[PDB]
Amino acid sequence: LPLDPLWEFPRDRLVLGKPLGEGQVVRAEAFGMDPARPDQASTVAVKMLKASDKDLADLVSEMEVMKLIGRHKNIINLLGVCTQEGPLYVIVECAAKGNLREFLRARRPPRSSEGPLSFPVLVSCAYQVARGMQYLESRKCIHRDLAARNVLVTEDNVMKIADFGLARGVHHIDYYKKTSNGRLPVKWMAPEALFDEVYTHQSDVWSFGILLWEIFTLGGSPYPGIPVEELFSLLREGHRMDRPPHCPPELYGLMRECWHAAPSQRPTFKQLVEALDKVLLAV
Numbered sequence: 001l002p003l004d005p006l007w008e009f010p011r012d013r014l015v016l017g018k019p020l021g022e023g024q025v026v027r028a029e030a031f032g033m034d035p036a037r038p039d040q041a042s043t044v045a046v047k048m049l050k051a052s053d054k055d056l057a058d059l060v061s062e063m064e065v066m067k068l069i070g071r072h073k074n075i076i077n078l079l080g081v082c083t084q085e086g087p088l089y090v091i092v093e094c095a096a097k098g099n100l101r102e103f104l105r106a107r108r109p110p111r112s113s114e115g116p117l118s119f120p121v122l123v124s125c126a127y128q129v130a131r132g133m134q135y136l137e138s139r140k141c142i143h144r145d146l147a148a149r150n151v152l153v154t155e156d157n158v159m160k161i162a163d164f165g166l167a168r169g170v171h172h173i174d175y176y177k178k179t180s181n182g183r184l185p186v187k188w189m190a191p192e193a194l195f196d197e198v199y200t201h202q203s204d205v206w207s208f209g210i211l212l213w214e215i216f217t218l219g220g221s222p223y224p225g226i227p228v229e230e231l232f233s234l235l236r237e238g239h240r241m242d243r244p245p246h247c248p249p250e251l252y253g254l255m256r257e258c259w260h261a262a263p264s265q266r267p268t269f270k271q272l273v274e275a276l277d278k279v280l281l282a283v
Contacts, residue, residue: 001060001083007067009033009080009091016046020094023049023059027094033079044079045094048087056088058167063090065165069139074132076152076162095152095160100125103153104219120280121157122215123251127276128159133208134269136164137201144168144199146207147188148214149181170197176228184231187222191235192263202263208272209258216247250279 015029028046032038047062049055066078082089097103109115129151136143143150143164152160175186175194190206192198210222223231223241240259243252254275260266267275 007081011082043094045092047090061167062165072135074128076160096155097153099149100151101148101219108218130272132161137269143204146204205266209255212255217244
């Protein structure tokens with residue numbers, strides 16, 4: 001691997017800590033990530049191999065994607081890399097509150113009538129994800145698995161889209177795959193992706209609609225009670241999820257637009273940002 005001085009960070013300035021998931025991602029302390037404060041500690045996340053040569057190329061691929069995509073408030077940003085004299089590390093921002101799905105589920109409801117989550121904050125979460133996706137789209141990045149579990153939450157409740165630069169094996173998806181936390185990722189796939197193996201930014205818009213439903217069910221799992229075999233047949237029939245409880249029609253409206261059969265008849269991310277902004281400003 002060649003040295004890129006723009007991004008190289010000394011590995012001896014990292015102290016590896018608790019693993020965050022399984023390549024693998026590990027929480028770490030970094031010293032002098034800002035070269036103006038060389039002895040200052042910060043908390044970062046380090047992506048690394050668990051590994052085959054294919055596994056290595058995929059991580060290098062993600063690294064190069066992240067270099068090109070540039071900075072945005074609502075994505076997990078690249079901070080540095082360690083490529084020389086040791087294992088490949090890709091250092092990115094660490095979001096203190098974990099993923100959005102778990103953030104919502106943990107916060108389900110003199111203030112006994114009040115849970116931690118209010119309507120304007122739920123809308124803000126949706127707006128921020130749309131802003132991040134608008135940015136990624138402007139950089140010609142299709143996410144391909146946009147979902148609440150792939151949005152991370154900072155200490156200040158800022159949404160950051162994660163894992164947007166993954167080499168995903170799109171031509172070998174096990175549609176019946178259930179994760180160790182019980183997720184069926186097929187439930188986020190646009191029909192053109194699932195059925196025809198076509199991905200565009202409009203397929204991410206479909207997934208955003210599913211994410212919207214996750215937000216307004218406070219981390220509910222989509223298509224409740226529906227196994228994959230039934231999901232296939234239901235999608236072929238044009239099945240859409242019901243309006244969740246305590247969800248205004250404006251937001252279910254947006255969900256249904258995101259799930260229009262024709263990709264060109266779904267909103268763009270720019271339109272979603274504008275629509276959600278209007279709801280946010282309506283108080």
